[PDB]
Structures are given as C-alpha cells and as structure tokens.
Design a protein around this ligand. Sequence first.
Ligand code: 3PE
Lengths: 80, 139, 105, 98, 344, 97, 317, 163, 169, 48
Amino acid sequence: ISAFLKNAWAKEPVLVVSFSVWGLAIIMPMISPYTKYASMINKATPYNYPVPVRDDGNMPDVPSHPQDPLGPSLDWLKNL
Amino acid sequence: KRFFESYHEVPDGTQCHRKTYITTALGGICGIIGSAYSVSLNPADSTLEAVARVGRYTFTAAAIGAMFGLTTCVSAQVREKPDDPLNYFIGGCAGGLTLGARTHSYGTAAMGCVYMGTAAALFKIGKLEGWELFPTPKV
Amino acid sequence: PFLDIQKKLGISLDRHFMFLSAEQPYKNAARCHAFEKEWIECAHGIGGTRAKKECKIEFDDFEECLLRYKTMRRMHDIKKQREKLMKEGKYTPPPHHSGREEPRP
Amino acid sequence: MNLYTVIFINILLSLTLILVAFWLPQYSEKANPLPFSMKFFLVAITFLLFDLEIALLLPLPWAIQTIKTSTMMIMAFILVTILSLGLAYEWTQKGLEW
Amino acid sequence: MNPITLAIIYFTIFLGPVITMSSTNLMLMWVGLEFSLLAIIPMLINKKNPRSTEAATKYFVTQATASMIILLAIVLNYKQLGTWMFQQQTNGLILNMTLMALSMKLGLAPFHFWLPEVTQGIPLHMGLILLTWQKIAPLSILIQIYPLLNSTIILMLAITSIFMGAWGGLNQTQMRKIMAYSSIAHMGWMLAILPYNPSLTLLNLMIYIILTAPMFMALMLNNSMTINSISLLWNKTPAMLTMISLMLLSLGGLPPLTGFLPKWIIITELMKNNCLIMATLMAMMALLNLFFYTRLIYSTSLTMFPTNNNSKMMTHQTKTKPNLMFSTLAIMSTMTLPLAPQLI
Amino acid sequence: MPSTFFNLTMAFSLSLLGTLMFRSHLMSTLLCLEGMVLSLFIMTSVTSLNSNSMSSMPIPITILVFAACEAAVGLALLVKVSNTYGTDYVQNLNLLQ
Amino acid sequence: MFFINILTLLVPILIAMAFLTLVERKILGYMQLRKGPNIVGPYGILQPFADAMKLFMKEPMRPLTTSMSLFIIAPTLSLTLALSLWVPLPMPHPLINLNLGILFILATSSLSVYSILWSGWASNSKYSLFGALRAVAQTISYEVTMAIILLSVLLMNGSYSLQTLITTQEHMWLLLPAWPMAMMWFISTLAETNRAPFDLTEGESELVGFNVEYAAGPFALFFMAEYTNIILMNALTTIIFLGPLYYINLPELYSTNFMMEALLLSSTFLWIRASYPRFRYDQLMHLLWKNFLPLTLALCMWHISLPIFTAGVPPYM
Amino acid sequence: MNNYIFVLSSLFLVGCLGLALKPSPIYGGLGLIVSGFVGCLMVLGFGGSFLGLMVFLIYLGGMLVVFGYTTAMATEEYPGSNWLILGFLVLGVIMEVFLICVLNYYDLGDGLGDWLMYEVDDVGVMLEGGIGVAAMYSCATWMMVVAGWSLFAGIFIIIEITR
Amino acid sequence: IVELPTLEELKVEEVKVSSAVLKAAAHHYGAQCDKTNKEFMLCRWEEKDPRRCLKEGKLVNGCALNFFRQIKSHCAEPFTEYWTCLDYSNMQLFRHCRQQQAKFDQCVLDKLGWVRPDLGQLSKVTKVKTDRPLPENPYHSRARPEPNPVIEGDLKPAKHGTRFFFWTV
Amino acid sequence: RMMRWNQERRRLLIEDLEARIALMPLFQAEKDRRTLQILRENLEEEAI
Ligand SMILES: CCCCCCCCCCCCCCCCCC(=O)OC[C@H](COP(=O)(O)OCCN)OC(=O)CCCCCCCCCCCCCCCCC
C-alpha cells in the first residue's frame, strides 16, 4: 500500500493533494489549541444593543457599570 | 348565481317564463362545458367543424333544458298541483324526448325518457323532503 | 403531522421556523412579531374550531399587521380627498409639503 | 441610480458602435455562409448540479461569523464532500471523460 | 443498475414519502413530494423501450406542474398568514388549489388520464410502486389538511373518479390498465371520506394496498399483461387461480370478503353525515367495477381458456416461487372481515 | 407590493396556461415550466423580504435547488425522446393510447 | 461630475484596449524576432486607429443569418458587460461601491456566455454552431472553478466587497497564503477569455469559431470586449492576490502600483499566446473536471477551517 | 420613480406571456433570460442584494443557459413565424393593460406608493439578506441537508436516465 | 385620537454635532452619561412605546450635551484635531487617527479624570436600577380563552364492547 | 501573518462596534421623538 502511493505521487500528483488537504482540514480544527476561540471571538461582537436588566439587588455578578471589574471581560481576545 | 336560485324561490307551476329561461341556461351551460370536453379530447378536424359541435351540443342541451322547464311548469299549471314529482317526471320525460330527437333515435328517447324523468322527479322529491347534497361535515 | 417521528424523537428539524415570530437570525424580530404571538398564545389549548371564532380579534389584527390593507383604504381615501380639495385650492400643500418647517435630528 | 446611469451608458456606447457599423459602410452571393453532443448535455447538467452547489456555498462568508462556528464547519464539509463523491462517481462512470 | 445507484434512488423514493409524512413545515412536505418525483423517473425507464420514454415524459410533466401548483399554494399562504402551513383562516381558493394539485399527483377524476397511460408502459413491478407507495405521500398531505378542505369539490372528484375508473375499466383488456383504472376508483372512495373521517381514508388505503400488492405480484408471477395471458394461469400455476379469484372480487365490494369493509364503513360514515345522495350513486357504479372484475374471473378461473403447446414446456421447468408476501397479503386481505371492528 | 404581487401571480397563471396548452416542441414546455419557478422564487423572495422574515430566506433558494434538478430530470427525458424519435414533438408521444 | 467619471472611465479603457491590440502584436513580434508596427505612427502607436477606422467601414454583411436580432444583440451584449465589470472594480476609489461586488463581477462575467451561444446560433453554419457549443462548455466549466477560487478566497477577506480586499492586503499580498488558488485562478482567467494556450473556440487551424461569420463592426465589438476584460481578469489579480499600497493619503500610489502589476499580468498573457500549443478540447476539460476542480474543492474546505482553527475569522465589514 | 416595481412587474408579465405563447425554443429562452433579469432587479429593489444577485447567478446563466444549450443540441430544429407570435404578444402587451385597466379605474393604485420596504431599521446592522440564507448552517440545517440529497441523488438520477 | 405627544413637548435642546465627533467621543460617552442612557433603554425595551419613555429621552439628549460641553471648555483644540482627521476617511476608522487618540486621551486623562474603556467594556449588560413600574400586560393582551375542559377518570373496559355490526365482541 | 492580523481586525471591530453601543440611546431617543413628531405633525395636516 505504501509503495502504491509512490506512483500515485509521481503520476496522478493532484488527487493525492486533493485528498490530503480535503482531510487535513477536518483534523486541524479538532486538534488545535485555538479552535475554541472561533465560536467566542464571534460571540463577543455586539452587533445589536445589549438590553440592560432591571436591578433587584439579587444580582451580584451583573456589572453595574461598563467599567466595573465585573462582567464579561475579554483580556483574552487581546493578545489572543 | 342569485339568478339560477330564483327558479326555486317562486312556487312551481308559476312564472314559467323564468323557469324555462333558467332551465334553458343551465342546459346550455352544460352544453358548453360538455362540448368543451368533447373538443379538447376527441378533437375536431377543422376549427369550424368544432365550432359546429359546440353549437350542436349547446343547442341540444339548451333544448332539453327548455322542454324540461316548460313541460314541468305547464304540467303543474294545467294539473294545478304545484308539488308533485309527477310534474317533473313529465318534464324530464319530455326533456329526454328532445335529446332523443336531436340524436335522431327513438330508442334513446326511451331510455332518455325514463332515466331523465326519473332523475328530475327525484330532484323534486329532494327539494320537497329537504334532502341535502354535498353536505358539510357535521358528523 | 401524519407520522410524528419528530416529536417522538424529540428532534425539531421542521418546527423551529414555521411562523414569523420564530427565532429570527440575530434576534431581528420581523414585522408583526407582536401580533402573531398574541394570536397563537391565544389559540393554544383551544382547538381550531374554537381558534376561529373567539380568537378572531387577534387574527383580524394580524390580518392587518401584515396585509396592512385597511390602512391603505384609509390612506388612499385621504389621498383622494386632498386631490379634490387641492384642485379647487380648498387645500394647500402643507408646510411639510413646502419642505423645511425645521427638519430636525 | 448611478449604477443605472453607468450600465445604461455602457449600452448606448455598444449600440452606437454597431449603429455606426451598419451605417458607415452606407448580392454577389456574399452572404452565403447537427448530431447530439450527449457529452455536452451531460457536462451542462453536471454544471447545473454544481452551479447550484455554489449557490449553497456562498453563505459561507456570512456563516463563518455564526456563533455555532463548529456547526457551520460541519455542515459545509459534508456538502463539499457529498458533491465531491458525486463528481467522483461521474469520474468512475467516466461521465467526466470526454 | 450499479447497485449503488439502486440504493440512492430507492432511498430517495422512500425518503420521499417519509419526509412528507413526518414534516409539518409545508415546504418540507413539498420537497418530499419533489424527491418522489425525481426518484421514480429513473426506474420508470429501466427497459428504456420506446413506450417507456413516453411514460416517464408524461408522468414527469403531469407530476411537475402539479408540484409547482402545490408550491404556489404554500407561497400564497405565506403572504396570507406568515406561517408556512395551512390554517383555519386560509383563503378557500388557496386550499382548493392544493386539492386539485394533489388530486393530479394522485391522479383522481378529471386528471385521471396520465395514470392509466403510465401504468401501461412501466413494468409490473414499478407499476406497484407507482400505484401504492406514491399515493401515500400526497394523501398524507391531504389527510393532514382535511379539516380545511372543501366538502363539495372532494365529493365531485370522488364521484367522478368512481365513474371514470369504472367506465374506463370496462373496456380495457390490458391488465396494467385495468389496475390503473381500479386504483383511480378506489382512490375516489378514499377522498370521499377525507373531509368527514380521515381515519377511514387510511383504512380504505391500506386495504387497497393489501389487495393490489398481492394482485400485481400475481400478474407478474406469470408476467401476464393480458387477460388472455392471465387466463392460461390454470396451466402455468393452478393454485393462484383460487386466490386470484377472491382477491379480485375482494377488490370490488362483495360482502363475505375483506373488501366490503372499506365501502361499508365509508357508506356508514357518509350516511352518518347525511350524504345519502352521494353515497348511493357511488355504491351503485361501484357495482360496475365488479362486472369487469368478474369478466376477468370468468377468463382466468370459472372458464378454462385454450393454451399453446409450449405451455407444457414451461410447466416442466420448476416455477420460480411467489414470495411469501403473496400469501400473508392474500389471506389478510381475502378474509379478515370477521375482524372488522378492530380494524376500524 | 400588493399590486406587484398580482403581476407575479398572473405571470404564474400565464405560465400555467402555457404548460397546460402544449404546441409541438416539448422543450418549450419545460422552458415554460421554469417560468413558473422563477415567478414562485420571485414572489417567495419578495414577501419574505417585506415581512423582514429572514428565517425563511432559506426557502427561496431550496425552491430553486429542487427546481433545478427537477428540470435536469425533465431535460434528460427530453434528450431521451429526441434520441428515440429525434424530433422532440409532443406529437409522437402516443404509443400508450 | 458623476458623468465626468464615466467619461474618464470608459475613454481610458477603450483607448487602452486599442493599444493592447498593438502591444499584443509587438511583444509577440520581438519573441518571433520580428518588429511589429513601426510605420503608421512613430512605433505603431497609431495602428489601432487605422483598423478601428477601417473595420467599421467594411460592410457589416448580415450573411443570411437566421436572426439579425441576435447577430446584432450578441456583439453588443459583450461590450456592454465587459465595459460594466469595470464599474465596481475596487480601485482605491471604485466608480461605484457595491457590497456583493465580487458576486457582481462573477455574475456579469457569466452572462457573457450567451454572446457565444447567440452569435453561433444566429449565424447559420456548422463551424459557428459547432464552435459555440464547444466554446461555452469551456466557459461554463471554468466558471465552476472560478467561483470556488472566488469563494474560497472570500473566507479570507471575509466579505464580498472588492473594496475590502485592499484592507485585507493592508500589510501583505494574498498571493502568499493562496498561490494554489492564484495558479488555478490565472488559468480560469486565461481560459475564460477564450484566450491563450486555451483558444479552443476560434480554433483557427482546426476551426476557421463563432466570430467566423462576423466582420467589420460586429466583429470589432466582439474583439473590443475580449481585450477589455483581458485587462479586468488581470486587474482582479492585482486586487485579490497582488495587493498594492493603500494610504488614506496619496491615494494614487495604489493606482500607480495597480498599473505596474496589471500590465505584467496583461503582459504575462502575451508570453502565453506566443508559447503554448493549444490544448485540445478534451484536455481543457480534463484539466478542469479531473484536476483543477478536485484541488479547488479540497482547498475550499481547507480555507473554511483556517479561520476557525486559527481563529482568524475575518471581520464582516 | 415610485413605480419602480410596477413597471418591472409589468415587464415580468410580458416575458411570461412571451414564454406562454411558446415561441421558438431559443427565441423564448431569451424571454426567460429577460424576465429573470427583471425579477433579479425587483428583489434588489427590496434590499435583497444577495437573494437577488443569486438569481442572476444561478437561474439566469446556470439554469437558463444550460437550457438553451440543450436546445441547440436538440429541440432547436427551428423547422408559425415568431413574428406572428410577436403580433399576438403585442396584443397581450395591451390586453393585459385591459385587465389592469378595469381594476385601474376601480383602484391601491396611482402607480406604487409605499408598498415596498414596509419596515426597515433606521439604525442597525446585520439586517441584510444572506444572513437569513445562511441559516442553512444555524437553526435551519435541515433545508441544507435535503437540498444536498437533491443535488447528490440528482447526479445518480441523471446518469441513470441518460444510460 | 391615538395619543401623539404635542410637538411642543418633544422640543429638546439637541446634540446637533456630526456623526464623526460622536464617533470620536463615543467611548468616553459610554463611560460617562451611562446611568442616564441605560435607564432610557431599560424603559425602551421594557415599555415598548416611544410615547412613554420620552422622559428619559430628554435626559439622554441632556447628559450628552453635558459630556461635550466639558470637552468644549476642557481639551477642545486637541479634540478638533482628532475628529478632523477621522472624518477624512470613508468609514471613519479609528485605525488611522491613532496618534490623535492618545493626544486627546492624555489631555483628558489629566483633566477631567476620564479613562477610556478597555476593549470589551461596553458589551456587557449592566444592571440598571430604575423606578418605572413594571409595564404589566405589555402588548395590551386581551385575556386569553380557557383551555378545553379535561375529561377525567380512569379507563374501564369499553361498554358492551365494540359496538360494531352484530360483533358481540 | 494572516492569523495575527485578522485577529486584530476583530479587536478593531469590537472597538468599532462598542462605539455604536454607546450611541444607540442618543439615536433611539432622537428617532423616537422625531417619528413621534412626524405623525402628530401629519395628524395635524390630516386633521388641522
Ligand atoms: C363465505 C363463503 C365464500 C365462498 C366460499 C366458497 C368459495 C371459495 C372460493 C372459490 C374460488 C375459486 C372457484 C374456482 C376454483 C377452481 C379450482 C380449480 O380449477 O382446481 C385447481 C386448483 C389448484 O390445483 P392444485 O391444488 O394445485 O391441485 C390440483 C391440480 N389440478 O384446485 C384448488 O384450488 C384447490 C383449493 C381450492 C380452495 C379450497 C376452498 C374450499 C371452499 C372454501 C369455503 C369456505 C367457506 C367459509 C364459510 C364461512 C361461514 C361464516
């Protein structure tokens, strides 16, 4: 099997690449340290406006002000 | 449509003119439809030939319509009994006869008379007994 | 439907997007999102035979949120009126028509 | 608008240039100057079943920015693949071969 | 057929009706109908005989325009109600379109011309699929929308079909077309009760499937597309003569056999709903269907037609057997009547 | 839109009358058949667009994708016919009578 | 002054094309060791005006064409589109801004196919019909390889806007990420002009193609529209793959460097004409259907992953 | 103008009437290619850049072109002068005007007013077709799969028919 | 008559400054003038009506003009050089006027004590406390109809059996 | 270099979109009172 690839790399040297990159692209996402961020860098974009919720005093996390230390702070996207 | 219905509104045997006119139209309408199917399928040879067939079927049907209307109305008039399947049967009887003639066949007149008249009579009964056709689902 | 292999399997490949008030992409609500809601939370638990007479206020409204025809008749009528009066000068293009009137932010 | 003006001007230029072409000049048998290409038709619907392929692949530019990026990737790969396997069958069928 | 292709097609011919049935978004119901159209056309031209190409080209045009009309109904609804599905409010014309269109794909009544002709040019096998696994899909769409369709039209298409089917059948001598005509008729009864009791449509179908599937595998056991051909059944295979007799009389409504139940309960439901005008006329010409069924009975069983000498040669050779399905579907069909209450 | 939606609908009916009144060549029909799919595609896209119903835009295209193959099948039947008769006239398709 | 823009957008491409007829005769010449035009002007600078002012004066013989309607709509379609694909071109400042720009360029490019179909069919002839059918096969087959190269690449600049390709290239040319795409793009721009080692149509030695029955004006236009998108499909490579400088200030530098690379890619096609024996019609297809299309589809799959795993999903807008 | 759409709509009907008189197989292809151009334009009118261009990209040059293609291969036998058809077509050109006319006097009407772009966000982004068509990959991934099988089994259906 | 506020009422001093300057002083307009702008939104999304939160609207049109008024006295000239280059672009990118940005930020870091937010500190959903009573029955939904009643009990073998035709079952 | 750069175009977009977040209140307030000034002013021209 391994020496059959040798003529298929000498002659037919196209379909080899096309079935070597067809796949390579299926394994790069499953094995990369940085694939988690694509659904996150794309999740941070505030395209529409963030509606604020009414305060009850029962919500400690919700950052009261845009500059509170609380809330979704992305010091990640920076120097991702 | 308020038109055709009128036929029923006035008591039978009365205002035959309207009756005959309405009945003649229905037959004629059927004539057109019938000729249409007869021309669409089993087409003709020349446009004129087919226009003729439309005419033939239309007139024949219009005739059966008229005599039905006329006979039933008059039979009721002369007989003075407005509600009677027999009036209609005589009418249907006549209608069939016109069909028979247009088709130039005594035999057809036979079946035509019996079958057609019976059907019309049943229409009268249907109206008299308030039979419902194509009823809405009431389960 | 005829064979509910979807509810059974719990999958929802065909139900999530059947009405205008379903989840629109990027939460961009469509026109009438208000009504259709009001006309389907009404007809929920009440079968159709009775979603057709008593829940008629919400469809008569939703039939005019989307067709938006009764409006036309209003506006179209208004239009004609203006026309007739204007022809006899009874009515004059409003200051708005004259423009200006302080178009503001 | 501007686009209209341009595309329209672009037409007028084309027409004029054929207007002038048939008029500037101002018999002799000067004017005197088939089987089915089944292969061609095949190639043609191969292109139809593939052009529509692109039409379902053009959303990628705007789906890459979907939250469920993992889902897009998966959905796309299958399309590109199932279409490649189709082409591949054609290859074996030798339909691709001319 | 490269067995792979056979799989893809057959899967589609089977994914086609199944998507229709399972989905509620009408659109997805339309593409279920669309697939079925695409999958059936390859099989129809398998012999690729000159008759076949004619068959498929008709089936396809009739199927395609109807498919487009069904889509138009969905497109129109989308603008009369944002929903992608018929509702109480739906404009009446919107639903009537769907009835006509779907009555073309199913081939009922004044649109009954394509079916007899495509049933004539396709093999006996693909004949069955074209008659019974392609009726499930459209009927599903109708049965789902029954509450909303018109009682008048359905009835007219119902009655017409019964008549056309019966009258057409009387003259036909080609078996494939006799069956095509019967299917038009039975399809008629089915659509008659749809507005009133859909659940009975699903009985008048199954029974039709449990009756027609054995009947066709019978016609092909000896691959006879002629009555003269089925008449020499007594020499080619004598046993099937008994059940072929009962199944055909079962297809018509005669009382001891299973075939009476669909007609009986449809008549009971229509009288319960007061259509004693319509039901009566239907039952009467239904009796015309049995006449042509019994005329075939005469030729195949009650009378023995003369056979050719070479028939002795075919007897010698072992007859490839009829699948088991024939039996299980012949008996469950010819005699289940004693078990009607649980069927309905 | 209400006005226009009419034109498109009648376009579909004019295309309907076309496919239901054949004349010689079949390729004309199939071509007409396609005229409907365009009218349906245009109407579906139009209402989806003025209902701002983006969840439904998938459909306008699914309609085209299915319609294209549908037509592919239709043309292969057509090629099959002018290979068996070579004239593609709806006229000779009558063996099944 | 919008009209001033068209007048300064169509004159400076019909006056450029004209001198590509010249430059396609001299560069080919000196490779053939033969001077091109030298005489009508100083160095042939005045030759296209001659055969411009000459072809149009030859009898536009409508040779018993089946339908003039086509004979005279095909040649106009072409120059109409070709001179339109320039309207959304992404210079530092495009004549018109069109989101969906790259689609526009793709779509309009496609319509051109008709010119081949219509012209071939109208002019009744074996050669004409033969060439057309064969020619469009090529054109259409190459659209499917262009689109993907076009699509694939998009995932990288992340929008269909030509005008963003410049930004995506603010610090690098996309030739280096995608030279495989740029190879097959070059052939899909070199063979979708029915040009080069790939001139199957207008096969001259074998076929005498579609434009055969065309002469004088009707021909000129068909021609003018083959050299006015011989400069497009190189002008795109100078936008999509070769990214010149763009500075908010000095907005010419881009156009100047756009020049320097579009002439090479317009002068690179000229080495081809003078270098490669023509592909045979079967081979051309097998180049796309069995070699390029596979690589193109796989690399498209590669580019949809690259953003996700490199987390480089481009910014919409 | 305001009748930006109507006029076009009218042109779309004219092209459909041309296809309906069933003109010569390829002369009418043009007809489709014309109304496809027209329908491409209307959708653009409503802001469906993507959906619009899509039609101009697939049905226009993909489907239609292949159609005529085949016409040339067969069913372009090019054996009633289309001119007769054009004669009738002209009749319809104004005959349709008649149909519209009755409702014209009856009169929506007076051209086209605000019967387009009913509601648009005067602020905001991501509002654009192609965001909806890209729901094939999020929240509408069943339409995508079934379209796949169409095209995929399409290959197998076509070859099988061809063979 | 549908309630439509009097034009007089709608009158409010207005920002009237082109989009470019707003885009320049926006990130500081998110830091400052936030409590006065989020409560408008919190009315706007809760109370779906522009005929009721006009109260807080006039507040937004107020705090903003306040924001700039300080910038006009404090650190106006370096602010003019900032948006004057930013408006030169075709999409008003911060990517270009990046030197003008710090020169305005250090001028405003020292004076007025403002610090420009970090990257992701305007996309978080702050919780704003307000007093507006919760708008119940928003959408003015007329009372819904009742569900069909529920037949209740347990199944018992059917009465007298399938009541079909003489099937004593 | 296409990794490290397109990441930045994202971070510039967040910078560019959060600007838009800060000015929805001013615009939505102006847009409310503006369209709420058109149709009292059109209510008049219809009523006045
Ligand atoms: C409700 C009652 C309904 C009616 C029941 C009575 C009728 C039953 C149906 C009969 C239909 C066919 C009539 C004609 C049959 C002709 C048979 C024949 O020609 O003989 C050959 C045939 C096969 O031959 P083979 O078995 O292979 O060996 C002999 C080879 N010469 O030889 C055979 O086929 C042998 C096997 C024949 C089938 C046997 C059936 C026996 C009768 C069944 C009665 C059931 C009564 C149920 C009563 C219910 C009351 C509630």
